[PDB]
């Protein structure tokens, strides 16, 4: 019966008959047409979706204002409300909004598909303080991801808000009016001023959706469907539905009902509403915490301290304390601290009221202590701690917020007046199994007595066998979560064991000098530097200038078109994809009989379907699948919904095959292509050495993590068959090549369009045109319009990642640490197809900055039955490079010389000569390794940092220093051709295009920094709208680090003819404008029209005797990176980093400095945080805290100084830059091997000598379990073969 | 090409003119339409000389193409345009001309 | 360089497609932009000839 | 199969422009009143010169 009435940017929308299972995101995008609110991954993580929601409270008389993630917003319960998009605060056609004018202005936007959520973030922080501190700004931006920038410069734009040689002008940029924004929709205050009591409902014939406004209606709804869950935020039942298959045909959703949302503060303690949001409690409880005396604020601090790295802003301003409490998940952060508080809840039903206590059986279901089905959670009491009780709360995940506990705890003690006599003790845990779990047992055996050493062994000991875990317990890490367990113990035994000191100095004793440390822990602030080059030069000449790029304020304002944000095109089609679910097996059968019955179905494609076009050069399989992901069927219907609701319903059945290969080990048990480099004589040179060495590390893969997932868009013009292609990839020649291939048409037929792409990274050229061939053909053989975009989930699986690398080597050395000997071994992990490329780059630029005189490499991929990985940002080098990285700091160990000593003596010369007999320059090498020192101030910080590790036993400082060559070629010449299209119309304006792709790099913007050079013309006068086929032919692919180098130099090629032409009109009129000179030279019969060509750098390799030229410069730099460990948790913080780099003459600071940047998080990411598990099945888990994590604002060095080496010409390039973008990857590892070093000290310290080999990712886990201690001795352990583990 | 199609069939002449000067068949030349965003600063279709220019133009575009792959061309004079068009990208000779 | 005109054919023109069609078209352009939105316009036989 | 101009499919949220045209040969326009016309169903704009 109901209509839906809310505003979206102050404009009123009404559905009528409104279908309740419409979310708010896929409504604004489609329904709306409002496309600057992305999708991103769909579970509320990201924060691409984040926008503002408004509400009046008519009681208080006040307008809130919340922030959200739309993607788990149901538009049911935006009735009443206002949102707001990024759209709705300003545009390019009105007037840009600070926020929007600043984020691009500090160049805080590269391929900009996060900008919006960023945007919504601090313009709803700054509408509730308008004159903020920084720490609240980066609080706001913690549930906000990004790809590209490094976030340093989104954090420089925050700054200019607060009342506290540069890339942006700070002074220019326009004052925050806060009076003059947006005014909170009047009718929705009128609306409000009269409480209607009639509750809501929608309907469909799947669904009903009942908003009960009052409490008397709620208890009603709540006995009649007494099954039905009763929505607040949906941010737990959301998430399941999306992908843990589940459905409720009845939701109950209530509104404000006032007494779920009351806050009383009681004599004996306060009593929190059951339907405040998480971060509404978060500043009831700071209050509270500064109002009152630090006895009674016991728990109020424990909640406080969960709540501040819980999520992120958007999650905890939509999510309920109740919805929390009944959620019941193993991993909550706030259900073991209240379990351990004598928390009681209020219950309420038709029947009565009732009071039941928050415990152990609550939080494991037992319908005894449950809720019974017909009530609600009004409201929960969390009372005042008394004197001399105590209660702490512990954590460790993945990175410190936005991430899921790996193992949480709440702890609590009561003394009881003076002596030291424990009288009371509750022990609860989580992510320790299904349910939080309180240890009782053990905690009764504890009561009587006394707190010291004594209790604590005896203690661990009787916890490590009632709360264990079986080896194959669902989340893996069973030995890490094990040492949470008493490590956790042992930090509250510590903590309590102060505040009574504290207290009571005469009866208790001092902690150990050297103990201290675990107590605080590591907490941030985010500083940088920026040192670059700026007289000769015309100042109308832009190169060298650190110019915006060019959509930089459309990325801010959403109104930048990413590939799904084009309008609908009538009757287009949705393709998905169903994909095998087993790693080798045979297909025994398909049913497709229920899935083509359902609504809205045209059509599901096996192979079959595709006969004689299913390979290139296969994409559904056939009656095999060799890994997980791989493509079954396509599903085309009507819509998105309609057909993932089909593709669920299709049956295949399996029959699994042997061998199951997993690793690189299992994959050596026919033949290999080898590939080979030999220097010097590496079998005499073992002879007259000092020490031989073997080692070897294992290196994980990484996931490209491009914000805009896989997304195409496949138009046939209904003539000829001809079809338009737009498509998100990094290769619109190789796109249009599979689809006329596939097509069996010509390829001037098939034509591919790109604008922009939504970050790549190289995951959007193999894999991307297979789906887009497999969705040409539905398009063909249905004359429609197909649309085919990918879930964060389906694209992680489809797609492959970086190749992981076992590195084996012998290294032959002096005992002065240098190195005559070098016997190194490389082999990826191809995934079930092939990669060989990866190799041979690898072994090309492993030396990196070293001279290894005997030197034999050797490399082979490997095929195992997991995704097929693909090339990714270093191409084979962030492998290759810690390989030999770690090759040096072991020899470094067996010298007793650090690392940096190793280095700096194995290091090219001046001169020097490649392992490939290439002749290089490293003069560039040596400054960059000089200044790093330097600016860093390496020596004075060493002494610092063997200071605090010989004063800290459970804290550990390093640091490392790791220099960069990184070469930059191609295989041929050929491969290096680039070709443009420049036309010059009557009214002097410009038109340009190329066959370089924008991912964020800002390749358009240099292009018209040349333009506008070549031609003498303003910016502003020169245009380019895109990419095509069509314009520019045959062009290859974007990648290698050398698009803007070579389509610069064939936009130069275009400009200079056109400029030779013209030269007779320009020396007639000096004076004159472009406009004249074009219109006199049509009017003399001049064409104004040219292809800009270039034919490529010289290039080879000759791999059989292992020598060649292959590369065309290299960039050089160093990198210094400084950590703090925690020894008890495996956490870590990166306190500071400083990268020197050699970029040449920098055609724009400000977009190769974010390259850097960008690189530099990116490979950070990949050797410590980002990790894949995989089961012994092959099935990549992707739930709880197996959830895979990109760097946040939490993983940014405290510290961050930058600075580009002073120029010195390259004439072969373009105007003498250096093409870095690949570079700056292989620079994150000076954090691994900071984490390496710190690592040691721990080691040295408790004498634990010999083999330590740290595998990268350098996890959480992985550092922990280096740092042995008494802790690591104690837990009890498996036998290997005895169960199934749940990853490795 | 800068020439529009009324019925007076320039498109067709035009592929007649790109099939006799690069020596291939109809059949494997395409048009799709007229665009300034291809072809810039285009006079008007009419005069009764659309095809007579954009004719010329055409003419001028393929011969272009044709002396750049002449070496190509002569080298191995039994080959087909998929063979030649390749090795000219292998030789990094450009394909594209304007007229 | 931000206006571009496509034209895949005309079904017959003899001179009268030029002038007044781009009137038209400037017209239809300025609605379009002004409200963001795409803007058809096609006439009757009897207001052609008019 | 030939697409001409008005062939093209529906693009999204597209609007639908026509003229009024002048019913006298040489007259001077008093007035305009558009007030009916404007409050009708589906209109968006009615652009005169001014
Ligand atoms: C991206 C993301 C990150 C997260 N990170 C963390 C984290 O770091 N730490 C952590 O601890 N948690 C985390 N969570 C979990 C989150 O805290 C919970 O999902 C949330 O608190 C549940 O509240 P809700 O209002 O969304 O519940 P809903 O999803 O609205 O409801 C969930 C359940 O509670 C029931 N319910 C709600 N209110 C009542 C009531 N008054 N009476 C009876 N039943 C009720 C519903 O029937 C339903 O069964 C995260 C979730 C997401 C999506
Ligand atoms: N923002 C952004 N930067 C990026 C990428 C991307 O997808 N997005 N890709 C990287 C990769 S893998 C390559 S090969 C280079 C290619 O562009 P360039 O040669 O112009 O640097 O950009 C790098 N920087
Ligand atoms: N079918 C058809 N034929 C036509 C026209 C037309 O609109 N349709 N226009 C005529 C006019 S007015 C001119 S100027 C010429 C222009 O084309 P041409 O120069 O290629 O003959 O075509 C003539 N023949
Ligand atoms: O050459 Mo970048 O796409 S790995
Ligand atoms: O020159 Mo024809 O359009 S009268
Ligand atoms: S947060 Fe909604 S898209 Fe990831
Ligand atoms: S710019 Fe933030 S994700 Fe690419």
Redesign the pocket.
């Known amino acids: 019966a109901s209509e839906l009435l809310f505003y979206v940017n102050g404009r009123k929308v009404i559905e009528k008959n409104v279908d309740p299972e419409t979310m708010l995101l896929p409504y604004l995008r489609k329904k709306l047409r409002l496309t600057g609110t992305k999708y991103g991954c769909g579970?509320?993580?990201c924060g691409a979706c984040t926008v503002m929601i408004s509400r009046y409270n008519p009681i208080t008389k006040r307008i809130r204002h919340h922030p959200a993630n739309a993607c788990?917003i149901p538009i049911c319960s935006l009735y009443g409300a206002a949102v707001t998009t990024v759209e709705g605060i300003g545009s390019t056609h009105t007037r840009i909004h600070p926020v929007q004018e600043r984020i691009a202005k500090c160049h805080g936007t590269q391929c900009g598909f996060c900008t919006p959520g960023m945007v919504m973030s601090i313009y709803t922080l700054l509408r509730n303080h308008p004159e903020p501190t920084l720490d609240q700004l980066t609080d706001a931006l913690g549930g906000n991801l990004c790809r590209c920038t490094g976030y340093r410069p989104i954090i420089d734009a925050c700054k200019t808000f607060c009342k506290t040689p540069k890339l942006f002008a700070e002074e220019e940029f326009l004052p925050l009016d806060p009076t003059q924004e947006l005014i909170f929709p009047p009718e929705l205050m009128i609306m409000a001023e009269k409480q209607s009591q009639r509750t809501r409902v929608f309907g469909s014939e799947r669904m009903m959706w009942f908003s009960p406004v009052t409490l008397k209606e709620l208890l009603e709804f709540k006995f009649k469907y007494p099954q039905a869950?009763?929505?607040?935020?949906?941010?737990?039942?959301?998430?399941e539905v999306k992908f843990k298959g589940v459905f409720h045909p009845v939701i109950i959703s209530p509104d404000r009902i006032e007494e779920?949302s009351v806050v009383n503060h009681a004599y004996n303690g306060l009593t929190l509403g059951?339907?405040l949001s998480?971060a509404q409690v978060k500043d009831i409880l700071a209050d509270v915490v500064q109002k009152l005396p630090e006895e009674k604020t016991q728990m109020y601090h424990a909640l406080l301290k969960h709540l501040g790295?819980?999520?992120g802003s958007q999650?905890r301003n939509?999510?309920?304390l109740?919805?929390?409490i009944?959620?019941r998940?193993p991993?909550?952060?706030?259900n073991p601290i209240l379990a351990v508080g004598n928390c009681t809840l209020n219950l309420l039903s038709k029947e009565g009221k009732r009071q039941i206590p928050l415990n152990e059986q609550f939080l494991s279901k037992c319908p005894n202590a449950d809720?019974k089905p017909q009530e609600?959670?009004v409201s929960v009491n969390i009372p005042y701690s008394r004197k001399w009780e105590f209660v702490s709360a512990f954590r460790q995940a993945q990175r410190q917020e936005?991430?899921?506990?790996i193992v949480n705890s709440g702890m609590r003690v009561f003394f009881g007046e003076g002596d030291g006599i424990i009288r009371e003790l509750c022990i609860s845990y989580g992510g320790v199994g299904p349910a939080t779990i309180c240890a009782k047992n053990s905690c009764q055996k504890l009561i009587g007595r006394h707190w010291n050493e004594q209790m604590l062994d005896i203690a661990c000991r009787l916890i490590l066998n009632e709360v264990s875990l079986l080896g194959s317990a669902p989340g893996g890490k069973v030995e890490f979560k094990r040492t949470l367990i008493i490590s956790f113990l042992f930090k509250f035994y510590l903590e309590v064991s102060q505040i009574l000191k504290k207290m009571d100095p005469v009866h208790y004793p001092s902690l150990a000098d050297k103990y201290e440390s675990a107590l605080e822990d590591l907490h941030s602030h985010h500083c940088s530097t920026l040192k670059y080059q700026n007289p000769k030069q015309h100042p109308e000449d832009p190169i060298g200038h650190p110019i915006m790029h060019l959509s930089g304020v459309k990325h801010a304002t959403g109104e930048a078109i990413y590939c799904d944000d084009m309008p609908l095109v009538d009757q287009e089609l949705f393709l998905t994809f169903v994909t095998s679910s087993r790693a080798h097996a045979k297909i025994v059968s398909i049913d497709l009989s229920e899935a083509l019955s359902m609504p809205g179905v045209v059509d599901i494609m096996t192979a079959e379907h595709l006969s004689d076009v299913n390979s290139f050069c296969k994409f559904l399989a056939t009656d095999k699948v060799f890994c997980v992901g791989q493509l079954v069927c396509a599903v085309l219907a009507d819509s998105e919904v309609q057909a993932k609701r089909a593709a669920k319903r299709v049956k295949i059945v399996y029959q699994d095959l042997e061998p199951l290969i997993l690793t690189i080990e299992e994959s050596i048990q026919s033949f290999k292509p080898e590939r080979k480099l030999e220097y010097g004589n590496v079998d005499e040179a073992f002879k007259v050495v000092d020490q031989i060495l073997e080692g070897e590390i294992h290196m994980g893969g990484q996931e490209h993590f491009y914000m805009e997932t896989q997304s195409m868009l496949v138009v046939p013009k209904g003539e000829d068959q001809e079809m338009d292609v737009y498509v998100s990839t990094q290769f619109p020649k190789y796109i249009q090549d599979i689809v006329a291939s596939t097509l069996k048409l010509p390829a001037n037929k098939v034509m591919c369009h790109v604008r922009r792409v939504g970050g790549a990274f190289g995951g959007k050229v193999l894999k991307t045109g297979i789906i887009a061939a497999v969705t040409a053909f539905a398009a063909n053989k249905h004359g429609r319009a197909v649309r085919c975009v990918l879930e964060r989930g389906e694209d992680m699986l489809i797609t492959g990642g970086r190749h992981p690398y076992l590195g084996k080597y012998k290294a032959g050395f002096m005992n002065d640490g240098r190195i005559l000997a070098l016997d190194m071994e490389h082999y990826s992990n191809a995934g079930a197809s092939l990669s060989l490329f990866v190799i041979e780059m690898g072994l090309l630029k492993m030396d990196n900055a070293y001279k290894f005189p005997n030197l034999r490499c050797r490399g082979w991929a490997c095929r195992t039955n997991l995704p097929s990985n693909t090339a990714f940002r270093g191409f084979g080098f962030p492998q290759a490079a810690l390989i030999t990285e770690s090759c040096i700091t072991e020899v470094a160990a067996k010298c007793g010389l650090s690392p940096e000593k190793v280095r700096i003596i194995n290091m090219y010369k001046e001169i020097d000569q490649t392992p490939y007999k290439q002749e290089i320059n490293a003069k560039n090498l040596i400054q960059c390794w000089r200044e790093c020192m330097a600016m860093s101030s390496y020596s004075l910080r060493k002494v610092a940092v063997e200071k605090f590790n010989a004063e800290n036993y459970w804290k550990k400082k390093g640091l490392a220093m790791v220099p960069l060559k990184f070469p930059v070629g191609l295989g041929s010449r050929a491969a290096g051709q680039a070709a443009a299209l420049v036309h010059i119309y009557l009214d002097g304006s410009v038109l340009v295009t190329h066959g370089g792709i924008e991912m964020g790099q800002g390749v358009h913007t240099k292009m018209i920094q040349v333009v506008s050079r070549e031609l003498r013309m303003p910016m502003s006068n020169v245009h380019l709208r895109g990419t095509s086929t069509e314009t520019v032919p045959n062009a290859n692919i974007s990648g290698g680090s050398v698009v803007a180098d070579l389509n610069g130099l064939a936009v130069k090629d275009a400009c200079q003819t056109l400029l030779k032409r013209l030269e007779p009109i320009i020396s007639k009129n000096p004076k004159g404008t472009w406009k004249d000179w074009a219109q006199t030279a049509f009017d003399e019969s001049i064409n104004l029209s040219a292809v800009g060509y270039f034919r490529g750098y010289e290039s080879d390799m000759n791999w059989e005797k292992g020598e060649g030229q292959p590369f065309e410069y290299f960039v050089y730099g160093a990198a210094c990176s400084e950590v703090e460990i925690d020894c008890l948790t495996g956490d870590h913080k990166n306190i500071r980093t400083d990268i020197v780099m050699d970029v040449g003459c920098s055609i724009n600071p400000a977009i190769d400095i974010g390259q850097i940047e960008g690189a530099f998080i990116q490979g950070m990411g990949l050797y410590t945080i980002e990790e894949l598990n995989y089961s012994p099945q092959g099935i990549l888990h992707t739930r709880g805290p197996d959830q895979y994590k990109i760097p946040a604002i939490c993983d940014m060095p405290t510290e961050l100084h930058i600075a580009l080496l002073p120029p010195s010409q390259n004439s072969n390039t373009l105007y003498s830059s250096k093409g870095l973008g690949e570079s700056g990857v292989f620079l994150g590892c000076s954090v691994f091997f900071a984490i390496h070093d710190a690592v040691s000290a721990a080691r040295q310290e408790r004498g634990l000598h010999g083999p330590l080999t740290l595998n990268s990712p350098l996890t959480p886990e992985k550092i922990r379990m280096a740092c042995e201690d008494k802790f690591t001795k104690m837990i009890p352990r498996d036998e290997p073969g005895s169960y199934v583990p749940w990853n490795v």
């Open positions: 579970g509320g993580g788990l869950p009763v929505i607040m935020g949906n941010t737990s039942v959301g998430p779920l059951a339907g998480l790295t819980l999520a999650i939509m999510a309920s109740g919805g929390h009944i959620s998940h991993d909550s952060d706030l809720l609600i959670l936005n991430a899921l506990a």
